[PDB]
Structure formats: C-alpha cells, structure tokens
C-alpha cells in the first residue's frame, strides 16, 4: 500500500523497486504528482528522476536511509524539466553521483535546472553507449527518440518486469498527452513506440504522471500520438 512519508508518496511495485512520488502546486493546473524511481541492488539504492524540488529530493533520501538504509550508489534522470532534474542540488549535496542524457545537461542551465555530473550517450539505435552509465547494474538505458522532448529517456529494470517511460507515457485511460510544450509533435508516437520496442517483455509501465500501468500505456499513447502528426 501507498506510504505517506511527509509530503510525498512511496508505493513498492516489486522486490527491490518503489516508485516515488512527489507533488508541485502549479498555479493554474493543480498539484501535479510526478513519479520516479528507487531500486535496490545488492548493496546499493539507485534512483530514477528527482523530486520536483531540492526538499522533496532530500526527503526521498530521508526515506531511503529508514526503509533502506544502503548508500545510494547514482541517480539517473530523465530529462531537462522540474519534475524529474529539479533537485539534483540535494543529490550533490548528498554526495551521490549524477547521470542524465548529454542533451538534457546541456538544456539544463537555459531550463533552469543544475545538470548532471555526467552525460549519457547514445548509439544510433537509441541504447545507451555502455562507458557513459558506468556501475548501472540492472539499469538499461534508452533514448527512444524525441517526443515529450528532444531529450527524453527511458529506464529498464533488468531481473523484473518494468520499464520507465517517465514524461513521454501516459497510461491507458489519459485523455490527453499533457504538457507538449517542449514536445516533438512529428516524432512522438514513433519515440513511443519504440521505447515499447527496446523493453518488449516489461508488463508493468511506470510513467511519470499516471500510475503504473499495463503496455496499454504504451499503444494507447501511441495512438494518441498518432493526432499529433
Ligand atoms: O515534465
Ligand atoms: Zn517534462
Ligand atoms: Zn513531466
């Protein structure tokens, strides 16, 4: 069951994985949950997006050490915007080491947001160039091609049945591709779909604004995508 812990939201999906959840009150919207990721392997915690902001992030890490309490070896996040890079200062503070898509640290000044330490990048079929995300373990990186930004990417979690599609998906019964203001209208159900296509036997989708779903997620994201172009 969902555990409140302050004013954030953890829910545990499988052994050693948990979704964290993290809100911002955005004049004009409502209070916008955004979703990550922690995952324990053997000895270690690693973590997928921060919260939106620095508090929230140190509150994520506060959680860790008491339901944890293993050393969070790096953070991954998944691209240049609030939700998932908004508190890399607290990872830094924390001493963890930081990893995001070149684009995404190279956006992140203009996008108000701190970058990352170190940049992923990618081979021409969008995986992840291994040397890039050293000590990932059974994170497998992809950048499925531009849609919810030119910089999104995407996060498999090997030894379980889920992959993270963060901003780009939208679970199944969304009405709507949500904040497209950065988004690539041409490419995005194409990136959609491929990102299905790196991860084909995950059966649980985690996105970053609706809660886990089926590869529901997946086509009927695409298929709304689909309008864009
Ligand atoms: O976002
Ligand atoms: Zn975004
Ligand atoms: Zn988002």
Redesign the pocket.
Known sequence: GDQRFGDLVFRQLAPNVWQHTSYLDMPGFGAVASNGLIVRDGGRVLVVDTAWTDDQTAQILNWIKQEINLPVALAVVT?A?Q??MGGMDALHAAGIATYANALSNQLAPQEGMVAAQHSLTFAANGWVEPATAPNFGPLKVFYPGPG??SDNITVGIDGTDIAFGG?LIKDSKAKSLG?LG?ADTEHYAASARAFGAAFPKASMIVMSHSAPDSRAAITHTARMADKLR
């Open positions: 691209h915007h939700d998932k919810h930004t901003c904040n950065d």
